[PDB]
Amino acid sequence: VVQEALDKARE
């Protein structure tokens, strides 16, 4: 979920 949570955070 981490890499997806980051993307969602930045984007």
Added chain:
Amino acid sequence: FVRDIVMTQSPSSLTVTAGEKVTMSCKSSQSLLNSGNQKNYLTWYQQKPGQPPKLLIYWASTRESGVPDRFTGSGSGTDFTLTISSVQAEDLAVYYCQNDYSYPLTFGAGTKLEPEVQLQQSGAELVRPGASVKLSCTASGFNIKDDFMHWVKQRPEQGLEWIGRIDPANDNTKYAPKFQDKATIIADTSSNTAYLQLSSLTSEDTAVYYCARREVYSYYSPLDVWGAGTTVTVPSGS
């Protein structure tokens, strides 16, 4: 019922003699591989006594800037290993591998080898069982609105325990299952400080609490900057 992902490190202890070759193993209960970008979300930390974990390697094999070539991270999916081609003196300490693939982030028990950007943390605490205490973490070199502020626990044992993390920008927080009640993470971008509150303290809470940051502007980044940590003592009695 969704698990947690267990990190099993071995050997736990290992007397070593200078020059020797050491090989530490880190296995995960579940895949740490992201088939999307083919990266293994495994990070290695080196920790000398009295200090907070130092970032060694992330994504399984990429060495952080400054770590000697004699250190090598390898492995894929569920089997990872850290190797020191020729152990040096200043190489001792304990080593932890961390699951950075999916929440909750979990650390292994580690392998103990036997022979300006920073985070300001509040003073040591002494508290009675049943009480609550607030710990503080102030970034001194960057804006916390640009990072995820994490809280890590570590009792005298040595095992690192992820408590949770918050997104100062949207106040979005994520908590490890076992700390979902005992902990509450708050952020105040104004003062650029992150707080952690523990309630209903027991002797099980006696430990060293560290805060850490994770940049969110890069595509990806592990937990690099760790504060010195705040010792919280909960003496049992009465």
